[PDB]
Design a binder for these strands. Structure first.
Ligand SMILES: Nc1ncnc2c1ncn2[C@H]1C[C@H](O)[C@@H](COP(=O)(O)OP(=O)(O)OP(=O)(O)O)O1
Ligand SMILES: [Mg+2]
Ligand SMILES: [Mg+2]
Lengths: 413, 554
DNA sequence: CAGTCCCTGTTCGGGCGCCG
DNA sequence: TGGTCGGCGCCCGAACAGGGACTG
């Protein structure tokens, strides 16, 4: 039986994923199980015991109003341990041309991986445990035989046979740039919605009769300008109204080593009343139209170093007011942006912060070919309590939690 | 007897060998029983004798049980475990009466000689080597090894549990309609059949189990309502924790206090509002669990208070999914909180508390949301649903704190419940300078290796002050300073700072902190009817800024 | 730059409780 | 005399961890 289960190993001196599974929902377990049921009946997974000390959290999320749940796993802790099998051996050539695509389309197809038998000597890590309500029964475990969606090598190993499934439509339409991340595939082009959409539907008839299957949907991240660090636009300035735009430009300075201080630092040198109005001279008034030009001029010191991890920071402002801090180093903001709750049913803090962690990453992956390391503004407990609720990203960005006073949020406000 | 179930594969820690520790002598009493057991155990094949070819050995002992002529035979496998590979525990949490749905028919079964019915793998058996001493301290001990999961082996648990689930796998599969709460070897069969048909299925289940080597002796709760299960008492329509006796004593040692808090923590699931803060507080000065510790007033009371609650019998009900799951919570003060979940007023499912003070600078609305999570998580663990809430915090005090806080805090579907002590932000902070208000410029500092430092302010209407601080730090100053700029100011003030440490602290409107000084700032803060607080860079020579530096930099 | 303090969080282990 | 194991909970202490502020 000439198949080819590619051998793989974890980094040197690295055990496997031993991460406790977390609480689910009635609805979530009922589907999460109904799934693994079929999934075993088709040898993708196989029940396993206690003697396998490896575990990864799992859960599901209905999606797109398919009103059909999809199974997902936080292989995060694994991909970190799964050795550079995904790094220094089988990297990914940055198709930087996708930034320009008029209209790109994303479509999950990893649903093909489950036809790619995984190295058995490795399967022992894909172990995930399902729980039961009120702890009626002990954890029902399982393992992976085929390729586990949402994993590092899961896409890497398949890509080879992938590219070869692409040649017919990827060479009869080389104008388009086709990128594959984790499970989702990206097809960015320039055609109009009347045409461009009718074609993604052809790339279907090609991939379904070639194996793969899949059930505003488009994107144009570049078609959206990062909102620069705007300043106030008044015609009278108070003692604080000034001391504020002062301390703001004192920090909004390391982003632009060239930004004027003294002319507006001069307007005060004595203990004055905050209410008091004291407009400016022509030099400090020209500094308002000057240090206001550095804020339309793209910062300089931005080098996308794939050698380091894409970090980010976020901000809670007001009425769906969140802001993008995509950077690789201190003040080295590669790109920044925002996100406001649309003119639809007004949701809540977390519900959005999540989309506003998903949206910001959807781009990070297109504009860079990878995902951030979000510095989160929410509380651990909180995040972990509902985050899983509002998520449809077949992947999971790494992240941390952080609490730090605003007035630093002003600069993006 | 012993089960045909598939044995389980266990290896040892890479490059590690078996135990080789001797048997620390035991009473002429335990030996008498160990020799009375193994006799049977070996006769039943649960253990095979061994000779010189077995290089390993580990000690064992015995235990009596709750009013039982029976002894439990244990093995001090501490060493082996260390050298034994490690498994993934399959026992996720614990079942809870409150998560049981009302059933037409219940039964409870306890598999006999549970572990000893599950076969240990043929290869590993070699390490479970032990030695059973002689009484006349003459004849060299007799040696054996287990052929079944040993009592006290790091792995027995997850294995048994696993082994068990697989044994019931077929029955549950062919009897989808019978709920079977299983915990270790403890079975609770819930059915909606009539006594007739249920008792019949109960036999089927039994025979099945025995046929797989699992005996279900008559220690099987039948028409036993109240059933005894997981430490409760299951009645036809309510349930309750078993007799939970506290220790009445005079002089209290430290673990003693430990047993109390533990128990009261056990009580806290149904007797509502047990409180522990002042008793747990009583256990910070980490010491000997044989060391006498004094009892405080706040403690002494908290004890007797709860001790009373435990006198009035209480109970809880079962779960009905065709009816909303509610949870209400109330403040018990000083950072503590109590709560209950019900579906029908006065007939609640479970009660509980939340006494953890997460942070050093938070308020009640922080501690309230901190609790709403505790309850959701937990709630999902039990009903796999998330409760609607009833909270003692105004429908606005919330639309304030959140739309106003810098973090995205969220609370599920919730209503208001006017039931003091309500929860409300103890004060606000003007987000717009207060006209006609003495504009103070505050700051201070102290020295690294040297003792003191200082802090002070300056008004825009002309006014000067500064104080000599002792043992302070870069922080104990900035704050110590904003403390006076309040008492030394009226209803309307306007302070400013170049620091952010003190800015964020007071940016959360905290009303409770571990640092007395902080409480003093808040304390005053509550008194003033308007206060603004902006920030401007430090050592960047800003108006009214530098003056303050110098006045203190000295 | 560093080497430092302050401070705020986290994580982890330990003890007791409850269950088997 | 005393001593085992696994699960979960509570609380406490210790060891981390990252900022911000200063010193050399
Ligand atoms: N104190 C303990 N130490 C280690 N394991 C225990 C302990 N108590 C219970 N167990 C584990 C091992 C047991 O085989 C299993 C079941 O114990 P249990 O149901 O209370 O009695 P048993 O099944 O060993 O025989 P019996 O039916 O006569 O009570 O749970
Ligand atoms: Mg038993
Ligand atoms: Mg200062």
């Amino acid at each position: 039986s000439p198949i080819e289960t590619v051998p793989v190993k974890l980094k040197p001196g690295m055990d496997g994923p031993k991460v406790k599974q977390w609480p689910l929902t009635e609805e979530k377990i009922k589907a999460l199980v109904e799934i693994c049921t079929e999934m075993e009946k088709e040898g993708k997974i196989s029940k396993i015991g206690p003697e396998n000390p490896y575990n990864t959290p799992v859960f599901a999320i209905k999606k797109k109003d398919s009103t059909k749940w999809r199974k997902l796993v936080d292989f995060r802790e694994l991909n970190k341990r799964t050795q550079d099998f995904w790094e220094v051996q089988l990297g990914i050539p940055h198709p930087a041309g996708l930034k320009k695509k008029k209209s790109v389309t994303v479509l999950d197809v990893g649903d093909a991986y489950f036809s790619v038998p995984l190295d058995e000597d490795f399967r022992k890590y894909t172990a995930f445990t399902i729980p039961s309500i009120n702890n009626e029964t002990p954890g029902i475990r399982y393992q992976y035989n085929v390729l586990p969606q949402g994993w590092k090598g899961s896409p890497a190993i398949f890509q080879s046979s992938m590219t070869k499934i692409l040649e017919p439509f990827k060479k009869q339409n080389p104008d388009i740039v086709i990128y594959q991340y984790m499970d989702d595939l990206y097809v960015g082009s320039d055609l109009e919605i009347g045409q461009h959409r009718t074609k993604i539907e052809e790339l279907r008839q090609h991939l379904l009769r070639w194996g793969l299957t899949t059930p505003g949907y488009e994107l144009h991240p570049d078609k959206w300008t990062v909102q620069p660090i705007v300043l106030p636009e008044k015609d009278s300035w108070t003692v604080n109204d000034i001391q504020k735009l002062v301390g703001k430009l004192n920090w909004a300075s390391q982003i632009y080593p060239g930004i004027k201080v003294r002319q507006l630092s001069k307007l005060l040198r004595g203990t004055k009343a905050l209410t008091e109005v004291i407009p400016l001279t022509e030099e400090a008034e020209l500094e308002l139209a000057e240090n206001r030009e550095i804020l339309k001029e793209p910062v300089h010191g931005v080098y996308y170093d794939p050698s380091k991890d894409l970090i980010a920071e976020i901000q809670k402002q007001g009425q769906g007011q969140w802001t993008y801090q995509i950077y690789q180093e201190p003040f080295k903001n590669l790109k920044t942006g925002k996100y406001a709750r649309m003119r639809g049913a007004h949701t809540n803090d977390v519900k959005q912060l999540t989309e506003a962690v998903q949206k910001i990453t959807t781009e990070s992956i297109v504009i860079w070919g990878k995902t951030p390391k979000f510095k989160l503004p929410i509380q651990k407990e909180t995040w972990e309590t509902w985050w899983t609720e509002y998520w449809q990203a077949t992947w999971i960005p790494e992240w941390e939690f952080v609490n730090t006073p605003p007035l630093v949020k002003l600069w993006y406000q | 007897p012993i089960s045909p179930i598939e044995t389980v594969p266990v290896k040892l820690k890479p490059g590690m060998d078996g135990p080789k520790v001797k048997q620390w002598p035991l009473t002429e009493e335990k030996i008498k029983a160990l020799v009375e057991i193994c006799t049977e155990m070996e006769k039943e094949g649960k253990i095979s004798k061994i000779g010189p070819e077995n290089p390993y050995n580990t000690p064992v002992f015995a235990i009596k049980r709750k009013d039982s002529t029976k002894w439990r035979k244990l093995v001090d496998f501490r060493e082996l475990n260390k050298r034994t590979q490690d498994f993934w525990e399959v026992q996720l949490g614990i079942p809870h009466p409150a998560g049981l749905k009302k059933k037409k028919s219940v039964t409870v079964l306890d598999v006999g000689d549970a572990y000893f019915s599950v076969p240990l793998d043929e290869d590993f058996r070699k390490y479970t080597a032990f030695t059973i001493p002689s009484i006349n301290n003459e004849t060299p001990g007799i040696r054996y090894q287990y052929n079944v999961l040993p009592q006290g082996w790091k792995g027995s648990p997850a294995i048994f549990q696993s082994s068990m689930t697989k044994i019931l796998e077929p029955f549950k599969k062919q009897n989808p309609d019978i709920v079977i709460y299983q915990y270790m070897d403890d079975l609770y069969v819930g059915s909606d059949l009539e006594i007739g048909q249920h008792r019949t299925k109960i036999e089927e289940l039994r025979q099945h189990l025995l046929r797989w080597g699992l005996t279900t002796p008559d220690k099987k709760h039948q028409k036993e309502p109240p059933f005894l299960w997981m430490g409760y008492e299951l009645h036809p329509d309510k349930w309750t924790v078993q007799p939970i006796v506290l220790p009445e004593k005079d002089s209290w040692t430290v673990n003693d206090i430990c047993k109390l808090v533990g128990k009261l923590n056990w009580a806290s699931q149904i007797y509502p509002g047990i409180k522990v803060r002042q008793l747990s507080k009583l256990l910070r000065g980490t010491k000997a669990l044989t060391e006498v510790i004094p009892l405080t007033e706040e403690a002494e009371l908290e004890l007797a208070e709860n001790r009373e609650i435990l006198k009035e019998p209480v109970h809880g009900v079962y779960y009905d999914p065709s009816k909303d799951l509610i949870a209400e919570i109330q403040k018990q003060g000083q950072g503590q909180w109590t709560y209950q979940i019900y579906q029908e007023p006065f007939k609640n499912l479970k009660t509980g508390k939340y006494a953890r003070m997460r942070g050093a600078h938070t308020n009640d609305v922080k501690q309230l949301t901190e609790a709403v999570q505790k309850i959701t998580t937990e709630s999902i663990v039990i009903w796999g649903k998330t409760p609607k809430f009833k909270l003692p915090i105004q429908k606005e005090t919330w639309e304030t704190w959140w739309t106003e806080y810098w973090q995205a805090t969220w609370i599920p579907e919730w209503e208001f419940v006017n039931t003091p002590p309500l929860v409300k932000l103890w004060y606000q902070l003007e987000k717009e300078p207060i006209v006609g208000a003495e504009t103070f410029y505050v700051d201070g500092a102290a020295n690294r290796e040297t003792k003191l430092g200082k802090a002070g302010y300056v008004t825009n209407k002309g006014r000067q002050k500064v104080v000599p601080l002792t043992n302070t730090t870069n922080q104990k100053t900035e704050l110590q300073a904003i403390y006076l700029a309040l008492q030394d100011s009226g209803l309307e003030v306007n302070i400013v700072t170049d620091s952010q440490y003190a800015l964020g602290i007071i940016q959360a409107q905290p009303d409770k902190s571990e640092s007395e000084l902080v409480n003093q700032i808040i304390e005053q803060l509550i008194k003033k009817e308007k206060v603004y607080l902006a920030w401007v860079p430090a050592h960047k020579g800003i108006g009214g800024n530098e003056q303050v530096d110098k006045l203190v930099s000295a």
